[PDB]
Amino acid sequence: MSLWVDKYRPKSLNALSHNEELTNFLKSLSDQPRDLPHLLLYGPNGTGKKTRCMALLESIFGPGVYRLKIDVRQFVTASNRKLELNVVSSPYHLEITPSDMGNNDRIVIQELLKEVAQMEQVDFQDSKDGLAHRYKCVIINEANSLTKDAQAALRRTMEKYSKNIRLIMVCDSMSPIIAPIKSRCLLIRCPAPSDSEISTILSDVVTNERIQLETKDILKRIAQASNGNLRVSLLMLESMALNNELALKSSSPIIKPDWIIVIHKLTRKIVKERSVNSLIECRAVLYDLLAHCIPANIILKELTFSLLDVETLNTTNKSSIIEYSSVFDERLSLGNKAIFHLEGFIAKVMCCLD
């Protein structure tokens, strides 16, 4: 069967367990959906933002929103280059990720969204108010990755055709979003689940999966080892259960992703050997990490938060490390070559620490 993270995902607003206040707010928004403004759901990753968006769409249109199909749209650049975009669609809504093509997301925004917004949904999709669903929903996933030109294009398309289309954009952070677009959306904060709620969900999965559990403390450790990420907690529970023959014990170790282990080993190496040869080996390790689809910003974040965890360092060294991380995060945000900035950050950290 499917993974436990996906097999037990709630499919309605009434099936949501944690964050009851947000559920009430979404239910309020769904009471009279014919005047729903554009929505921007922001919060930590792995909290259930997309699940809540799907639940709201189901409550607005119906269960048919969960019948999804994948199609391919063709786009042509000014240089005659051809690109293909995979679009997830339902009889009531579409889901797009314009950042898939990179800097060409503006073409998608200016053509596909314009075409959808300029066409009227004449389908007699009888709603809960006795009138057929009129507006069409488009979910722009990973809006934080959109280029500023695409957002500028979206600005007026959001306003001119509000009668025909409503946008539900999901993002993890609002800093990359431009103020004009942020002003055109209703901001919805999605807090991460607490440890108790994560433990309750994990216990529900355990009971449904007939997983032998020595004590409930293991679920507490799993929840505390995820840092609010529910997807990580569920996948970790499944991995631990499989690795222990569905017989989780109080002494069962907590599993960690391979890239996390590599980053921690790199942190230890940096803290131990502060030399140019160590910097060359760190460059090799960074190349290895980056070549396998590990985002540079993620690497920088984990490296910064792992170096600060070392108990051999003093306050001044940690302050210097965090300052260098702050500077080089902006450097990364304003550059193409990530390895250059990562190597510069490692070099500065080695200089200060030594």
Added chain:
Amino acid sequence: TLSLQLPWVEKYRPQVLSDIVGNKETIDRLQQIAKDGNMPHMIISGMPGIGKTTSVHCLAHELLGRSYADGVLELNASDDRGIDVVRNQIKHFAQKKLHLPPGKHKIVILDEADSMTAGAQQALRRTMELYSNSTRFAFACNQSNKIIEPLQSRCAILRYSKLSDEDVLKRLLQIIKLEDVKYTNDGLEAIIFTAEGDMRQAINNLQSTVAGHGLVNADNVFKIVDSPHPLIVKKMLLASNLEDSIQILRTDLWKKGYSSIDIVTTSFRVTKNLAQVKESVRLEMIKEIGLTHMRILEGVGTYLQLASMLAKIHKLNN
């Protein structure tokens, strides 16, 4: 009035190789070639306004004479010089039969050859070797690094040098005598200083000064012609106190109509050629000037940014 008179830069263009001032060795060598013959393929390089095209045309004329019409093929940037042109028209001209004096050959003058594609230059290689007995090639360029090395190996290099004050003064005095111009030595000194070794600019400035106010003196010369702004930028960047540098930037650059982009680019160039200051300090000043240039290119161009750049430069030079 709807009938203009020819400017002195054209009315007094040297028509013989002996009337070209400056680069005595090269001019004498070209005169010897014109008197003897066996003209080799040549590439003449140098800065604008020194007499490369004039020298080439004078040499071709003195070498050919009545056969100049049928023995010279002059192509310039204003004329198409693509691969097809090189492979058809130049080849036909080289293969064309013309009966010339015993020691004369056909001439192909590719003016402004630095604006030619690498493919055309490559197609211009063998035509110069299989037809050297009938046609010779003269190129006139400003940047000599834009001509592919294979062609440079096939031609004699003539690197014209910057004209000195004496040559410009000599030619200007000759023109003054031929036009009966009332002048003051200070006026000629100012004209030479503002010309910066460009004979065309010197002659144009002299003509404008005479036609606008008459007597060629320092006051009249400087009334039309302004001092080179690169020297003003150099002076601003070499000041001791930030107050003096800001004053120079204000009363000499900002209020004279000079744009911020021009000021920053000139500062970058001058600092690049500021031999007096050490290399490291020059590099830091270049970094600051580049930051200011990037700020200006984004639309934030104001006297405040230039003042901050000057303050940072002064802090670096302290």
Added chain:
Amino acid sequence: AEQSLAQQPWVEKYRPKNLDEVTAQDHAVTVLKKTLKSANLPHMLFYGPPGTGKTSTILALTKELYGPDLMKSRILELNASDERGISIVREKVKNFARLTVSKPSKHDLENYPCPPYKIIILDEADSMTADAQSALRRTMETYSGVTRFCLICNYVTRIIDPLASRCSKFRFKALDASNAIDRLRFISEQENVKCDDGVLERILDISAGDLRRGITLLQSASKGAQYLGDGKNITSTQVEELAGVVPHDILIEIVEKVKSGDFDEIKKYVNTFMKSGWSAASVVNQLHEYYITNDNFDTNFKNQISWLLFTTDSRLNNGTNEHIQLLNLLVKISQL
């Protein structure tokens, strides 16, 4: 017809339809309204902060100048959603500007001023490249007798100096709780919104000069109140909760942790805090308000914290990680 706008979001529903419905932009609305009679409308450059009423103002001006019928034949609107390269500027805009003005009808001439010139509205012109803007220069001047240009932008510095010189500049002021309160109160009364005293003022203060954000917040509060269905008045705390404003208790806890000065404790507290989803911009603004408006600190501390907050805000405006920036700012303040 009526239902088309009666079922629309409040921001679109209550968009000004005439020039007298603009709340706090009289200094330019008066000029644009007297040009209705003077018939000498100049080239306009509308710049200001987001959500101040530029697009609405220009649309109302066009409606009042031409009318419902002649509008479409006398308006060329181009925004960031259309290709606006140098080729487009040279061909399409130039061609439209070189055409004769459409013939007004008898009804239009009798009921509307029908000015003798057309209008080209380049919205979000700040995104246009410099080359296209330069190409527009002489096109603006040559055909001034038949065409007028309106460039609408947010960052005035992105418009090349020549075009800014050719266009009369109009700055749209921020809509705060002092000049835009009337419009919000009118909207609330029309929508039958029951709110306590000061709730609208709090909404406008949180909006920070954006009336669209205030209208959206009011609509969200009305939806919540209707769903709950107790018949009580909306409270300010609800507005703050719906506006992503950190509770004062958490801010005081952060301040106390910073005062403690321990790096590990601050790091742990920030890690816990970042799990709630609070935006870093709101936290930075609240910290600035708390620190700059406190008498328990000396001049040097305020001088340093102002620059620290400015640097953090500038860094966060580029799309940087919020956790790292917030932790660095808090540590630096703790070491002040």
Added chain:
Amino acid sequence: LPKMRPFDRVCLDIQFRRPDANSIKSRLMTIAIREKFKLDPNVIDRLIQTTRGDIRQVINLLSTISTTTKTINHENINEISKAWEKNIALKPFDIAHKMLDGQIYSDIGSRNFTLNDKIALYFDDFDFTPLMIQENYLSTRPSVLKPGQSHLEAVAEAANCISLGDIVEKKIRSSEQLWSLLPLHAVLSSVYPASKVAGHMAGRINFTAWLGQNSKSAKYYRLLQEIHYHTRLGTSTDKIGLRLDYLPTFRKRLLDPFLKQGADAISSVIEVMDDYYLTKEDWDSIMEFFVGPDVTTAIIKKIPATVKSGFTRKYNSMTHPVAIYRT
């Protein structure tokens, strides 16, 4: 050159090199005797070094100089060689070697090799010079370090300026097309970082490794995109979340059974791949993503051949669903 890569090994590669002055001296002396102008034996080596061993260029030099000056002696070699000096553009490796030298950055050497020379050297190859500098700035023994400065601090400063130059490069190659900033880039990416770690090479000049790494990253990203959109109907995440979260668990549900159970686990793996519309090529691509202690190359190469053969045959013999129905 890439253009002539088709002629890699389909032809005999005969190499002609720059002829030495010893053989060309005889020809030059013969021409000197023939054409009635003087050329001392000590001048040929210098004249040949002027033209980078181009016999045609040397003959042209002699012909031109003989027009007016019939004597070529040690008194006039300097002027002739300076007027006819050949200027060839250095190639990536040569550019990197020259730039990372501590003699051109000295107070005496800076006059012979000015900042203009370095900036022009950058422009010889403006697409590879910054990459070569970034690749070869950590393999030198410096000789331009300030009192109290160590190698680590110098390399850190060079890396900071390299990051700034990378930002400038991003600005240059954008929609605005800001090529006027190219000179500044030259200083930020190539000249300044080299000036802080300049010295003597401690090894060989290695070619840029970022190009192949970028190609590998693009390949793996395309594979991850294909896998993600093959599983979008059964998962709630993005491609990054799929790589960081789902794949570690998918491995335990797809590869571990073979290691622990054997051939009997083929059915379970087939089932799991069927639940997420996963193909055999998708399985391989997924197994190629793991790094660190999770590398599966040796583990997969160690699996018994019978299990893999049975897995492949059973998958091919079975009918499987489709996620994207390309019409």
Added chain:
Amino acid sequence: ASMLEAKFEEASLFKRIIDGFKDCVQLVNFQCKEDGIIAQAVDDSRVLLVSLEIGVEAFQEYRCDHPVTLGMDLTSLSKILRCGNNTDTLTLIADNTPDSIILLFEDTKKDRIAEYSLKLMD
């Protein structure tokens, strides 16, 4: 359709007139009076000037109350004029203070009517 109503003998005539100078100049300006139509066009290079002086006798009927000036683009005019048959009658219609010129194509034998309006240029 008050000021100018001019029907040609056949659309082929006006077609031929237009093709005679459509590759020389781009923008033309006709000045239709009660005596006929006269147009002067200058080339971009300012080296060639084209002058057409069609007469009243070239039309089946020609009515023009007041002198009316029409500025037009030759590419667009030719493109529109290529939207008709060779056996039809073409009439030019212009109204008060023209903002566009109407080109009406009529075929009595086939009872075919086609309309085409081109916006004039200032």
Added chain:
Amino acid sequence: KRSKENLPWVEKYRPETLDEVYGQNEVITTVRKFVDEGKLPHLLFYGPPGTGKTSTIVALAREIYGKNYSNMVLELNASDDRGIDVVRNQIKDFASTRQIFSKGFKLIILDEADAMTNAAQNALRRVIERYTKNTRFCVLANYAHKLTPALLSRCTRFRFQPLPQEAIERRIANVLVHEKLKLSPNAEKALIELSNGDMRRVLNVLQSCKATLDNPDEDEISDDVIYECCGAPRPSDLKAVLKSILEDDWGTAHYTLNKVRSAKGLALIDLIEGIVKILEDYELQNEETRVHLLTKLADIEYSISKGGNDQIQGSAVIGAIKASFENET
């Protein structure tokens, strides 16, 4: 296109003849002398926006020719394609061909030539030089770094300085007489101060002021009207803000800045610029104070150019000023 009364003041008052161009006495006299004796060289008018370059060249062309100059000159601008093909074909034919209408020389005006590509400029060199006998070229520019050195060397340079106060006063008087308007002396001084040497700005602001007045017949344009229509700070407001920042505590300075800004919605950028201008006159005893002021204010201006948090920006301005002036003891 009804009449000239339905045109913007920037276009309604475009100098027709060369005698209506003010502030460029030297250039106007020189070009008029050249036209008189018939010694017109290849001209390069370099200057900032709105100084009278396009108007000057158009007036010169109309003076050389009659009212038919439009057909006797080749004027190309950025709005028209000017690639290498255009230079090779159209400009070359125009220069090498006689005049259709008259029997005089020909003028080519390459306005906004700074937007031309380097290849076109390089091709223009020999086109200019060869046909000099019967053709003359005029190039109008705002930035000189975009013009190739060869083109600059081939043309006589004339620099259009920013318009002095005197010419601006004369033109304002002419506009007031034509429009039947009254301008207060302090209003005139404020208008010239905000002009920055640009007459287009003056004309636009004067039109806005006329619009502001209830009845433009009797009412007078006071400085209050200038600041209301331009929405710019008042000198007293800038002085008060600087005094509060430099001589009061943080609370008082913050309150004063907020009150001044909220009184009439004053923008932060305008206040920063005015304070910079005011401090320019200040005689600082330490160079560090001026250096820090300039650097920090430039950084704040750059931050403002991209938006951000306005309150934090104002607090940063206050703190930077206070810290910089703390070094004056």
Added chain:
DNA sequence: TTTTTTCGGGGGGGCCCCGGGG
């Protein structure tokens, strides 16, 4: 001791198809 991104312009190769001639 080897090998990347984007607009705009320019160049150069490739057809396509109208027109005109036979």
Added chain:
DNA sequence: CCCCGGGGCCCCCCCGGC
């Protein structure tokens, strides 16, 4: 009625500073 000349788009390939 059929073949040939030569205008016009379409597609691709390479530069970009002093």
